[PDB]
Amino acid sequence: VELVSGKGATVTDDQGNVYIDLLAGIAVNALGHAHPAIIEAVTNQIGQLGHVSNLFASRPVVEVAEELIKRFSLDDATLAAQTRVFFCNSGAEANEAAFKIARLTGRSRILAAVHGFHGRTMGSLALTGQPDKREAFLPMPSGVEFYPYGDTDYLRKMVETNPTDVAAIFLEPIQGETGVVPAPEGFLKAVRELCDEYGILMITDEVQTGVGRTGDFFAHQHDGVVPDVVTMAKGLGGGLPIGACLATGRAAELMKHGTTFGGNPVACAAAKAVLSVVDDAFCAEVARKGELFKELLAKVDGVVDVRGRGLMLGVVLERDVAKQAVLDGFKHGVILNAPADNIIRLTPPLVITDEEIADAVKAIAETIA
Amino acid sequence: PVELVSGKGATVTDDQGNVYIDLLAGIAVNALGHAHPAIIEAVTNQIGQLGHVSNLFASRPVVEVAEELIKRFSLDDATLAAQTRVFFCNSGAEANEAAFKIARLTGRSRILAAVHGFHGRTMGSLALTGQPDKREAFLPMPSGVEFYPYGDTDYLRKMVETNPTDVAAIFLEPIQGETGVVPAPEGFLKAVRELCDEYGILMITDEVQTGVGRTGDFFAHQHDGVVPDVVTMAKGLGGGLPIGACLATGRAAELMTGNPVACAAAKAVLSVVDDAFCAEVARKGELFKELLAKVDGVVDVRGRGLMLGVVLERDVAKQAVLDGFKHGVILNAPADNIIRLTPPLVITDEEIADAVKAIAETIAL
């Protein structure tokens, strides 16, 4: 049903009802709606330069790139210097660039997590662990096999059946779909040694978990590993169409590809406004708000656990009623999500106030009744 | 290369301070040029009300644009408009991948696309791109695709007739842009519509480069009075903002069963691009073709409206793109004797004249 205007963690339908948004358009509105830094950034750019081809440079494109490199290589100027970024317009378009780097390795096998989601373009659909979403459009481009998320023992044996024909391993550091399933303890570190031994590219999809959403800038940094390649999008746009493929070392030298709106100046002017807000301390504020959700919900009847970090959270019910809670959620002034019958998912704008967190835990607690 | 920093109409300026006549419009995306007031207003107005809204909710700019595109495609056909529907995305590659999936959903394995065609660099959209050096590095591709010489009706029919009931889709650009500007020959689109109609095949027009009035008609395919099952469009719809779309009518629409700010910019361009605007684009089209005829180096000027390929006596296009800077022009060399012209549709007649005088002086040796 219809939507017209919003502010912070608030948005309002045609009829005039204000809602606490805990979905943020499926995790893209990281600064909420109509945020001053983004309004300045966009109004300022659209008034000067619209779109340039990748034949030409443009500042905001260059400046966002520099910045993601900074955020990625954590006060290491050597990692920084063998890193590069490719800009796209979605996370689908971003992962496709990732699938292409894995084709440029010369190896045929790409391995992806079982409930993973990377987008619905042919190559990014080839990576999505959900086979229902694949059935209708077979053939898929070949090479992908799937592994249970967080099972180092299976993945090791899976790799070692034909190890040097493994181009890439795709993982999300926190699975967004089917629930909020965070990389278990020791997992990305494990994948990092597995890839090191065999010449494989380690690729972390941060389309949903990127830009502070986790508490760290990049959810993968919570595990102190350094992937070869990071895909990102929603959250980076602050409400505008963007994606990016970041690559370090051999993966950077391999990339051939090129999108028309790659390096969209207005898309990137927004990207800059987002980054100038989401600094380390904003990210620390994300971790905190996350624990406040956990803490207040822990006390709520019918809520059994809350899993995730920062503002990507899986509220686990005990009554298979999440689908319903959504519907009844609206009448109590909250926009919720249900990636299962068990689980309500919260991905609110990272600028949510404790007040709004607290009302939102009220709204949710009532519906369960 | 060069850092561009601000533009208006048919001009851009670099940080060096150099001012150019943009005849490339960022590969035919900046239909209304840079800093068009109508887009500035739309984009400013929308950023400030709503940033992004998920497909799970409804937003006005999208349905406003969906309904306006259907009207410009249905050319006054109430019944066509009720049959047709549009899916929004962020790129033309993404738009052509939605058509590949529609092609997939027929049940048939064969998808026929034009040699020299370019549908984008995403796996599926690259599987449709009839320039092989773009695919070799990323084989295997999504299977299904075969290629015909562009506008060879005799060879298409034979190709279909090798296995007609397994052809899902025929991809086709109303005017090829890559490697040169070749428009569909007389009655080509006509033949493909007829050949598709028996054998139950989907006729799919990629108008990602030929859309929004650049060829003199709001859709280039409407110039040959054909109604395809699927039209993909992008660059141009959003002023410079990223957008794509996939129109489908009939069986194609039944098989398929950021945005607000790019649709906000889309609304403004459609607001600006009238039947009357497209007419002006047709005419500036002719003007170029007349003025350019007088220059020495030019042999021939192919293409309709403001999608034109300047064919030269000498194989000099690539050296003219380089020299074309100091004379204050931005050109592009799809072949060694071809220079593409896709300037903003807003280019004035004085601006054109100066642009031909610039190209002429550049092709001096």
PDB file of N, CA and C in Angstrom, chain A residues 1-3 5-6 25 28-29 33-34 39 42 46-51 53 55-57 89-90 93 96 100 103-104 120-123 137-139 142 239-241 256-258 260-261 264 335, chain B residues 1-7 26 29-30 34-35 39-40 43 47-52 57-60 90-91 94 97 100-101 104-105 121 123 126 138 140 143 235 240-243 258 261:
ATOM      1  N   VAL A   1       0.873  -1.215   0.000  1.00  0.00           N
ATOM      2  CA  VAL A   1       0.000   0.000   0.000  1.00  0.00           C
ATOM      3  C   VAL A   1       0.898   1.250   0.000  1.00  0.00           C
ATOM      4  N   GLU A   2       0.311   2.428  -0.265  1.00  0.00           N
ATOM      5  CA  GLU A   2       0.948   3.657  -0.843  1.00  0.00           C
ATOM      6  C   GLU A   2       1.825   4.383   0.198  1.00  0.00           C
ATOM      7  N   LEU A   3       2.908   5.038  -0.260  1.00  0.00           N
ATOM      8  CA  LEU A   3       3.914   5.769   0.568  1.00  0.00           C
ATOM      9  C   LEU A   3       4.339   7.052  -0.147  1.00  0.00           C
ATOM     10  N   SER A   5       6.034  10.328   1.884  1.00  0.00           N
ATOM     11  CA  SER A   5       7.098  11.137   2.553  1.00  0.00           C
ATOM     12  C   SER A   5       7.636  10.440   3.818  1.00  0.00           C
ATOM     13  N   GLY A   6       8.863  10.778   4.245  1.00  0.00           N
ATOM     14  CA  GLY A   6       9.469  10.264   5.494  1.00  0.00           C
ATOM     15  C   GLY A   6      10.563  11.155   6.083  1.00  0.00           C
ATOM     16  N   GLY A  25      13.482  -0.126   3.371  1.00  0.00           N
ATOM     17  CA  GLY A  25      13.442  -0.536   1.959  1.00  0.00           C
ATOM     18  C   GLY A  25      14.290  -1.762   1.749  1.00  0.00           C
ATOM     19  N   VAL A  28      18.395  -0.221   2.567  1.00  0.00           N
ATOM     20  CA  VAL A  28      19.069   0.724   1.633  1.00  0.00           C
ATOM     21  C   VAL A  28      19.066   2.126   2.237  1.00  0.00           C
ATOM     22  N   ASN A  29      18.045   2.438   3.027  1.00  0.00           N
ATOM     23  CA  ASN A  29      17.939   3.782   3.642  1.00  0.00           C
ATOM     24  C   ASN A  29      18.713   3.762   4.957  1.00  0.00           C
ATOM     25  N   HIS A  33      15.111   8.660   5.369  1.00  0.00           N
ATOM     26  CA  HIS A  33      14.573   9.416   4.210  1.00  0.00           C
ATOM     27  C   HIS A  33      14.847  10.909   4.379  1.00  0.00           C
ATOM     28  N   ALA A  34      15.166  11.587   3.276  1.00  0.00           N
ATOM     29  CA  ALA A  34      15.237  13.065   3.209  1.00  0.00           C
ATOM     30  C   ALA A  34      16.216  13.582   4.271  1.00  0.00           C
ATOM     31  N   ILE A  39      20.567  15.375   0.854  1.00  0.00           N
ATOM     32  CA  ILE A  39      19.777  16.390   0.102  1.00  0.00           C
ATOM     33  C   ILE A  39      20.754  17.425  -0.480  1.00  0.00           C
ATOM     34  N   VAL A  42      23.063  15.787  -3.321  1.00  0.00           N
ATOM     35  CA  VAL A  42      22.293  15.452  -4.561  1.00  0.00           C
ATOM     36  C   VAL A  42      21.884  16.744  -5.280  1.00  0.00           C
ATOM     37  N   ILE A  46      23.201  17.372  -9.056  1.00  0.00           N
ATOM     38  CA  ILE A  46      22.208  17.361 -10.169  1.00  0.00           C
ATOM     39  C   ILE A  46      22.162  18.746 -10.819  1.00  0.00           C
ATOM     40  N   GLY A  47      22.583  19.773 -10.087  1.00  0.00           N
ATOM     41  CA  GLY A  47      22.667  21.163 -10.568  1.00  0.00           C
ATOM     42  C   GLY A  47      23.932  21.431 -11.353  1.00  0.00           C
ATOM     43  N   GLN A  48      24.865  20.493 -11.447  1.00  0.00           N
ATOM     44  CA  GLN A  48      26.160  20.781 -12.121  1.00  0.00           C
ATOM     45  C   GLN A  48      26.421  19.751 -13.210  1.00  0.00           C
ATOM     46  N   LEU A  49      26.586  18.494 -12.818  1.00  0.00           N
ATOM     47  CA  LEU A  49      26.936  17.417 -13.775  1.00  0.00           C
ATOM     48  C   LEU A  49      26.008  16.237 -13.518  1.00  0.00           C
ATOM     49  N   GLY A  50      25.342  15.736 -14.554  1.00  0.00           N
ATOM     50  CA  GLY A  50      24.485  14.548 -14.414  1.00  0.00           C
ATOM     51  C   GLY A  50      25.272  13.256 -14.495  1.00  0.00           C
ATOM     52  N   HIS A  51      25.504  12.730 -15.702  1.00  0.00           N
ATOM     53  CA  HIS A  51      26.220  11.441 -15.879  1.00  0.00           C
ATOM     54  C   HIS A  51      27.361  11.606 -16.873  1.00  0.00           C
ATOM     55  N   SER A  53      30.494   9.346 -19.020  1.00  0.00           N
ATOM     56  CA  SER A  53      30.921   7.970 -19.377  1.00  0.00           C
ATOM     57  C   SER A  53      32.201   7.608 -18.623  1.00  0.00           C
ATOM     58  N   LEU A  55      34.800   7.009 -19.924  1.00  0.00           N
ATOM     59  CA  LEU A  55      35.862   7.633 -20.751  1.00  0.00           C
ATOM     60  C   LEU A  55      36.413   8.850 -19.987  1.00  0.00           C
ATOM     61  N   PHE A  56      35.581   9.461 -19.138  1.00  0.00           N
ATOM     62  CA  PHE A  56      35.916  10.683 -18.359  1.00  0.00           C
ATOM     63  C   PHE A  56      35.907  10.398 -16.857  1.00  0.00           C
ATOM     64  N   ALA A  57      36.652  11.204 -16.105  1.00  0.00           N
ATOM     65  CA  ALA A  57      36.643  11.199 -14.626  1.00  0.00           C
ATOM     66  C   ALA A  57      35.541  12.145 -14.109  1.00  0.00           C
ATOM     67  N   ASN A  89      25.304  -0.237 -10.509  1.00  0.00           N
ATOM     68  CA  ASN A  89      24.045   0.487 -10.197  1.00  0.00           C
ATOM     69  C   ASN A  89      23.180  -0.357  -9.260  1.00  0.00           C
ATOM     70  N   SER A  90      23.534  -1.624  -9.077  1.00  0.00           N
ATOM     71  CA  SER A  90      22.838  -2.498  -8.104  1.00  0.00           C
ATOM     72  C   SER A  90      23.839  -3.446  -7.445  1.00  0.00           C
ATOM     73  N   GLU A  93      24.233  -6.226 -10.068  1.00  0.00           N
ATOM     74  CA  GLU A  93      25.226  -5.787 -11.078  1.00  0.00           C
ATOM     75  C   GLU A  93      26.628  -5.873 -10.467  1.00  0.00           C
ATOM     76  N   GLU A  96      27.704  -9.628 -10.258  1.00  0.00           N
ATOM     77  CA  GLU A  96      27.945 -10.141 -11.623  1.00  0.00           C
ATOM     78  C   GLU A  96      29.399  -9.848 -11.920  1.00  0.00           C
ATOM     79  N   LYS A 100      32.333 -12.436 -12.668  1.00  0.00           N
ATOM     80  CA  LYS A 100      33.209 -12.277 -13.857  1.00  0.00           C
ATOM     81  C   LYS A 100      34.679 -12.378 -13.467  1.00  0.00           C
ATOM     82  N   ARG A 103      35.486 -15.826 -13.284  1.00  0.00           N
ATOM     83  CA  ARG A 103      35.661 -16.462 -14.608  1.00  0.00           C
ATOM     84  C   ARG A 103      37.046 -16.110 -15.137  1.00  0.00           C
ATOM     85  N   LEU A 104      37.577 -14.956 -14.750  1.00  0.00           N
ATOM     86  CA  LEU A 104      38.879 -14.478 -15.268  1.00  0.00           C
ATOM     87  C   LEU A 104      40.043 -15.205 -14.596  1.00  0.00           C
ATOM     88  N   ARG A 120      19.168 -11.215  -8.934  1.00  0.00           N
ATOM     89  CA  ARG A 120      18.310 -12.008  -9.862  1.00  0.00           C
ATOM     90  C   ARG A 120      18.690 -11.768 -11.334  1.00  0.00           C
ATOM     91  N   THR A 121      19.873 -11.191 -11.550  1.00  0.00           N
ATOM     92  CA  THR A 121      20.430 -11.133 -12.920  1.00  0.00           C
ATOM     93  C   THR A 121      21.018 -12.529 -13.127  1.00  0.00           C
ATOM     94  N   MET A 122      21.122 -13.022 -14.351  1.00  0.00           N
ATOM     95  CA  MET A 122      21.521 -14.431 -14.609  1.00  0.00           C
ATOM     96  C   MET A 122      22.734 -14.906 -13.809  1.00  0.00           C
ATOM     97  N   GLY A 123      23.840 -14.167 -13.823  1.00  0.00           N
ATOM     98  CA  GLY A 123      25.050 -14.633 -13.130  1.00  0.00           C
ATOM     99  C   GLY A 123      24.930 -14.526 -11.630  1.00  0.00           C
ATOM    100  N   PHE A 137      14.395 -20.448 -14.798  1.00  0.00           N
ATOM    101  CA  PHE A 137      15.298 -19.861 -15.822  1.00  0.00           C
ATOM    102  C   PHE A 137      16.537 -20.699 -16.094  1.00  0.00           C
ATOM    103  N   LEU A 138      16.428 -22.007 -15.954  1.00  0.00           N
ATOM    104  CA  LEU A 138      17.553 -22.899 -16.298  1.00  0.00           C
ATOM    105  C   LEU A 138      17.582 -22.985 -17.826  1.00  0.00           C
ATOM    106  N   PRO A 139      18.730 -23.119 -18.518  1.00  0.00           N
ATOM    107  CA  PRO A 139      20.063 -23.091 -17.901  1.00  0.00           C
ATOM    108  C   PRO A 139      20.624 -21.845 -17.195  1.00  0.00           C
ATOM    109  N   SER A 142      27.192 -21.890 -16.053  1.00  0.00           N
ATOM    110  CA  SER A 142      27.678 -23.048 -15.259  1.00  0.00           C
ATOM    111  C   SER A 142      28.830 -22.748 -14.300  1.00  0.00           C
ATOM    112  N   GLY A 239      19.741   5.923  -0.542  1.00  0.00           N
ATOM    113  CA  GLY A 239      18.457   6.064  -1.250  1.00  0.00           C
ATOM    114  C   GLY A 239      18.596   6.243  -2.744  1.00  0.00           C
ATOM    115  N   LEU A 240      19.750   5.926  -3.325  1.00  0.00           N
ATOM    116  CA  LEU A 240      19.972   6.153  -4.777  1.00  0.00           C
ATOM    117  C   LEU A 240      20.537   4.862  -5.379  1.00  0.00           C
ATOM    118  N   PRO A 241      20.397   4.600  -6.698  1.00  0.00           N
ATOM    119  CA  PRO A 241      20.890   3.366  -7.294  1.00  0.00           C
ATOM    120  C   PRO A 241      22.421   3.318  -7.390  1.00  0.00           C
ATOM    121  N   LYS A 256      37.216  -5.629 -20.719  1.00  0.00           N
ATOM    122  CA  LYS A 256      36.741  -6.794 -19.930  1.00  0.00           C
ATOM    123  C   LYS A 256      35.339  -6.488 -19.420  1.00  0.00           C
ATOM    124  N   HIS A 257      35.217  -5.684 -18.361  1.00  0.00           N
ATOM    125  CA  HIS A 257      33.870  -5.282 -17.868  1.00  0.00           C
ATOM    126  C   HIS A 257      33.707  -3.769 -18.018  1.00  0.00           C
ATOM    127  N   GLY A 258      32.576  -3.222 -17.580  1.00  0.00           N
ATOM    128  CA  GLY A 258      32.297  -1.782 -17.697  1.00  0.00           C
ATOM    129  C   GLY A 258      30.805  -1.532 -17.813  1.00  0.00           C
ATOM    130  N   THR A 260      27.561   1.360 -18.203  1.00  0.00           N
ATOM    131  CA  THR A 260      27.344   2.748 -18.671  1.00  0.00           C
ATOM    132  C   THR A 260      27.360   3.704 -17.476  1.00  0.00           C
ATOM    133  N   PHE A 261      26.416   3.549 -16.536  1.00  0.00           N
ATOM    134  CA  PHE A 261      26.321   4.464 -15.365  1.00  0.00           C
ATOM    135  C   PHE A 261      27.348   4.093 -14.289  1.00  0.00           C
ATOM    136  N   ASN A 264      28.347   6.858 -11.532  1.00  0.00           N
ATOM    137  CA  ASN A 264      27.273   7.868 -11.704  1.00  0.00           C
ATOM    138  C   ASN A 264      27.522   9.051 -10.757  1.00  0.00           C
ATOM    139  N   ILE A 335       6.670  -0.990  10.459  1.00  0.00           N
ATOM    140  CA  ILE A 335       6.926  -1.745   9.201  1.00  0.00           C
ATOM    141  C   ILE A 335       7.964  -2.833   9.496  1.00  0.00           C
TER     142      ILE A 335
ATOM    143  N   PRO B   1      42.606  10.489 -18.551  1.00  0.00           N
ATOM    144  CA  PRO B   1      41.764  10.993 -19.650  1.00  0.00           C
ATOM    145  C   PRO B   1      41.437  12.490 -19.457  1.00  0.00           C
ATOM    146  N   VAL B   2      40.310  12.819 -18.790  1.00  0.00           N
ATOM    147  CA  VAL B   2      39.800  14.200 -18.506  1.00  0.00           C
ATOM    148  C   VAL B   2      38.775  14.111 -17.365  1.00  0.00           C
ATOM    149  N   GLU B   3      38.786  15.073 -16.427  1.00  0.00           N
ATOM    150  CA  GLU B   3      37.758  15.231 -15.356  1.00  0.00           C
ATOM    151  C   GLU B   3      36.795  16.356 -15.757  1.00  0.00           C
ATOM    152  N   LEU B   4      35.560  15.997 -16.118  1.00  0.00           N
ATOM    153  CA  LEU B   4      34.436  16.933 -16.385  1.00  0.00           C
ATOM    154  C   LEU B   4      33.801  17.289 -15.029  1.00  0.00           C
ATOM    155  N   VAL B   5      33.286  18.525 -14.873  1.00  0.00           N
ATOM    156  CA  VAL B   5      32.911  19.138 -13.561  1.00  0.00           C
ATOM    157  C   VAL B   5      31.548  19.849 -13.620  1.00  0.00           C
ATOM    158  N   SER B   6      31.102  20.339 -14.775  1.00  0.00           N
ATOM    159  CA  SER B   6      29.727  20.880 -14.937  1.00  0.00           C
ATOM    160  C   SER B   6      29.369  21.059 -16.415  1.00  0.00           C
ATOM    161  N   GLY B   7      28.067  20.994 -16.701  1.00  0.00           N
ATOM    162  CA  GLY B   7      27.532  21.062 -18.068  1.00  0.00           C
ATOM    163  C   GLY B   7      26.180  21.738 -18.134  1.00  0.00           C
ATOM    164  N   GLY B  26      27.388  11.233 -22.986  1.00  0.00           N
ATOM    165  CA  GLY B  26      27.686  10.091 -22.099  1.00  0.00           C
ATOM    166  C   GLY B  26      27.082   8.829 -22.665  1.00  0.00           C
ATOM    167  N   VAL B  29      22.894   9.123 -22.909  1.00  0.00           N
ATOM    168  CA  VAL B  29      22.135   9.064 -21.630  1.00  0.00           C
ATOM    169  C   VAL B  29      21.587  10.458 -21.356  1.00  0.00           C
ATOM    170  N   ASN B  30      22.414  11.487 -21.543  1.00  0.00           N
ATOM    171  CA  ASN B  30      21.991  12.871 -21.207  1.00  0.00           C
ATOM    172  C   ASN B  30      21.126  13.423 -22.337  1.00  0.00           C
ATOM    173  N   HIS B  34      23.110  18.272 -19.326  1.00  0.00           N
ATOM    174  CA  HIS B  34      23.368  18.376 -17.880  1.00  0.00           C
ATOM    175  C   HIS B  34      22.689  19.629 -17.341  1.00  0.00           C
ATOM    176  N   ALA B  35      22.325  19.636 -16.066  1.00  0.00           N
ATOM    177  CA  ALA B  35      21.735  20.798 -15.364  1.00  0.00           C
ATOM    178  C   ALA B  35      20.432  21.260 -16.034  1.00  0.00           C
ATOM    179  N   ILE B  39      14.784  18.674 -14.598  1.00  0.00           N
ATOM    180  CA  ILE B  39      15.350  17.516 -13.832  1.00  0.00           C
ATOM    181  C   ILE B  39      15.802  18.039 -12.463  1.00  0.00           C
ATOM    182  N   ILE B  40      16.564  19.133 -12.440  1.00  0.00           N
ATOM    183  CA  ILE B  40      17.028  19.753 -11.163  1.00  0.00           C
ATOM    184  C   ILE B  40      15.831  19.805 -10.210  1.00  0.00           C
ATOM    185  N   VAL B  43      14.312  16.118  -9.171  1.00  0.00           N
ATOM    186  CA  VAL B  43      15.298  15.393  -8.322  1.00  0.00           C
ATOM    187  C   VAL B  43      15.344  16.074  -6.953  1.00  0.00           C
ATOM    188  N   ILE B  47      14.137  13.917  -3.730  1.00  0.00           N
ATOM    189  CA  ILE B  47      15.114  13.786  -2.608  1.00  0.00           C
ATOM    190  C   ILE B  47      14.712  14.901  -1.646  1.00  0.00           C
ATOM    191  N   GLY B  48      14.272  14.582  -0.436  1.00  0.00           N
ATOM    192  CA  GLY B  48      13.575  15.573   0.411  1.00  0.00           C
ATOM    193  C   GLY B  48      12.189  15.098   0.807  1.00  0.00           C
ATOM    194  N   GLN B  49      11.558  14.280  -0.028  1.00  0.00           N
ATOM    195  CA  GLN B  49      10.256  13.659   0.310  1.00  0.00           C
ATOM    196  C   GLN B  49      10.511  12.189   0.635  1.00  0.00           C
ATOM    197  N   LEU B  50      11.191  11.467  -0.254  1.00  0.00           N
ATOM    198  CA  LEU B  50      11.380   9.999  -0.139  1.00  0.00           C
ATOM    199  C   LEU B  50      12.645   9.590  -0.902  1.00  0.00           C
ATOM    200  N   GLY B  51      13.500   8.788  -0.268  1.00  0.00           N
ATOM    201  CA  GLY B  51      14.705   8.291  -0.952  1.00  0.00           C
ATOM    202  C   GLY B  51      14.407   7.029  -1.724  1.00  0.00           C
ATOM    203  N   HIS B  52      14.485   5.877  -1.066  1.00  0.00           N
ATOM    204  CA  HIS B  52      14.134   4.603  -1.734  1.00  0.00           C
ATOM    205  C   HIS B  52      12.922   3.991  -1.044  1.00  0.00           C
ATOM    206  N   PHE B  57       6.140  -1.931  -1.357  1.00  0.00           N
ATOM    207  CA  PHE B  57       5.261  -0.743  -1.181  1.00  0.00           C
ATOM    208  C   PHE B  57       5.127   0.006  -2.510  1.00  0.00           C
ATOM    209  N   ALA B  58       4.123   0.878  -2.607  1.00  0.00           N
ATOM    210  CA  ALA B  58       3.791   1.631  -3.838  1.00  0.00           C
ATOM    211  C   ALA B  58       4.248   3.083  -3.673  1.00  0.00           C
ATOM    212  N   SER B  59       4.804   3.671  -4.730  1.00  0.00           N
ATOM    213  CA  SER B  59       5.264   5.083  -4.711  1.00  0.00           C
ATOM    214  C   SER B  59       4.761   5.762  -5.981  1.00  0.00           C
ATOM    215  N   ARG B  60       4.366   7.030  -5.892  1.00  0.00           N
ATOM    216  CA  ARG B  60       3.758   7.731  -7.052  1.00  0.00           C
ATOM    217  C   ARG B  60       4.707   7.849  -8.242  1.00  0.00           C
ATOM    218  N   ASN B  90      17.894  -0.684 -12.875  1.00  0.00           N
ATOM    219  CA  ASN B  90      18.914   0.373 -12.622  1.00  0.00           C
ATOM    220  C   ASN B  90      19.823   0.573 -13.839  1.00  0.00           C
ATOM    221  N   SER B  91      19.679  -0.287 -14.835  1.00  0.00           N
ATOM    222  CA  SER B  91      20.586  -0.286 -16.004  1.00  0.00           C
ATOM    223  C   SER B  91      19.865  -0.925 -17.186  1.00  0.00           C
ATOM    224  N   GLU B  94      20.534  -4.666 -17.001  1.00  0.00           N
ATOM    225  CA  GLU B  94      19.537  -5.275 -16.089  1.00  0.00           C
ATOM    226  C   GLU B  94      18.189  -5.402 -16.802  1.00  0.00           C
ATOM    227  N   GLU B  97      18.347  -8.316 -19.217  1.00  0.00           N
ATOM    228  CA  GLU B  97      18.409  -9.597 -18.471  1.00  0.00           C
ATOM    229  C   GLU B  97      16.991  -9.997 -18.077  1.00  0.00           C
ATOM    230  N   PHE B 100      15.702 -11.587 -21.131  1.00  0.00           N
ATOM    231  CA  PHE B 100      16.310 -12.934 -21.255  1.00  0.00           C
ATOM    232  C   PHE B 100      15.520 -13.906 -20.387  1.00  0.00           C
ATOM    233  N   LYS B 101      15.072 -13.458 -19.224  1.00  0.00           N
ATOM    234  CA  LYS B 101      14.339 -14.334 -18.283  1.00  0.00           C
ATOM    235  C   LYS B 101      12.934 -14.559 -18.830  1.00  0.00           C
ATOM    236  N   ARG B 104      13.435 -17.005 -21.273  1.00  0.00           N
ATOM    237  CA  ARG B 104      13.582 -18.289 -20.544  1.00  0.00           C
ATOM    238  C   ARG B 104      12.188 -18.858 -20.221  1.00  0.00           C
ATOM    239  N   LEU B 105      11.219 -18.040 -19.791  1.00  0.00           N
ATOM    240  CA  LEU B 105       9.908 -18.494 -19.220  1.00  0.00           C
ATOM    241  C   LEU B 105       8.952 -19.031 -20.303  1.00  0.00           C
ATOM    242  N   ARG B 121      26.824  -6.003 -20.283  1.00  0.00           N
ATOM    243  CA  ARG B 121      28.036  -6.756 -19.851  1.00  0.00           C
ATOM    244  C   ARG B 121      27.738  -7.645 -18.620  1.00  0.00           C
ATOM    245  N   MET B 123      26.169 -11.262 -17.192  1.00  0.00           N
ATOM    246  CA  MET B 123      26.183 -12.620 -17.803  1.00  0.00           C
ATOM    247  C   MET B 123      25.108 -12.823 -18.872  1.00  0.00           C
ATOM    248  N   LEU B 126      25.223 -10.246 -21.611  1.00  0.00           N
ATOM    249  CA  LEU B 126      26.453 -10.461 -22.429  1.00  0.00           C
ATOM    250  C   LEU B 126      26.251 -11.669 -23.359  1.00  0.00           C
ATOM    251  N   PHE B 138      34.779 -14.862 -20.387  1.00  0.00           N
ATOM    252  CA  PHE B 138      33.845 -15.254 -19.306  1.00  0.00           C
ATOM    253  C   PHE B 138      32.970 -16.427 -19.738  1.00  0.00           C
ATOM    254  N   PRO B 140      32.014 -20.406 -19.617  1.00  0.00           N
ATOM    255  CA  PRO B 140      30.731 -20.512 -20.310  1.00  0.00           C
ATOM    256  C   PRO B 140      29.685 -19.412 -20.081  1.00  0.00           C
ATOM    257  N   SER B 143      23.401 -20.550 -21.662  1.00  0.00           N
ATOM    258  CA  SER B 143      23.171 -21.153 -23.000  1.00  0.00           C
ATOM    259  C   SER B 143      21.850 -20.714 -23.640  1.00  0.00           C
ATOM    260  N   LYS B 235      19.095   4.351 -20.555  1.00  0.00           N
ATOM    261  CA  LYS B 235      19.799   5.624 -20.864  1.00  0.00           C
ATOM    262  C   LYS B 235      18.908   6.615 -21.609  1.00  0.00           C
ATOM    263  N   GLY B 240      20.175  11.817 -16.089  1.00  0.00           N
ATOM    264  CA  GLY B 240      21.558  11.341 -16.034  1.00  0.00           C
ATOM    265  C   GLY B 240      21.529  10.402 -14.870  1.00  0.00           C
ATOM    266  N   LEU B 241      20.330  10.243 -14.317  1.00  0.00           N
ATOM    267  CA  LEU B 241      20.173   9.368 -13.141  1.00  0.00           C
ATOM    268  C   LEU B 241      20.067   7.907 -13.606  1.00  0.00           C
ATOM    269  N   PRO B 242      20.568   6.874 -12.876  1.00  0.00           N
ATOM    270  CA  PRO B 242      20.512   5.513 -13.405  1.00  0.00           C
ATOM    271  C   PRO B 242      19.124   4.864 -13.253  1.00  0.00           C
ATOM    272  N   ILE B 243      18.683   4.235 -14.345  1.00  0.00           N
ATOM    273  CA  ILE B 243      17.329   3.646 -14.543  1.00  0.00           C
ATOM    274  C   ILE B 243      17.429   2.604 -15.659  1.00  0.00           C
ATOM    275  N   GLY B 258      15.973   5.390  -4.822  1.00  0.00           N
ATOM    276  CA  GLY B 258      16.613   5.022  -6.092  1.00  0.00           C
ATOM    277  C   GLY B 258      15.588   5.084  -7.176  1.00  0.00           C
ATOM    278  N   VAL B 261      13.557   8.432  -7.030  1.00  0.00           N
ATOM    279  CA  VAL B 261      14.337   9.634  -7.440  1.00  0.00           C
ATOM    280  C   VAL B 261      14.709   9.531  -8.913  1.00  0.00           C
TER     281      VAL B 261
END
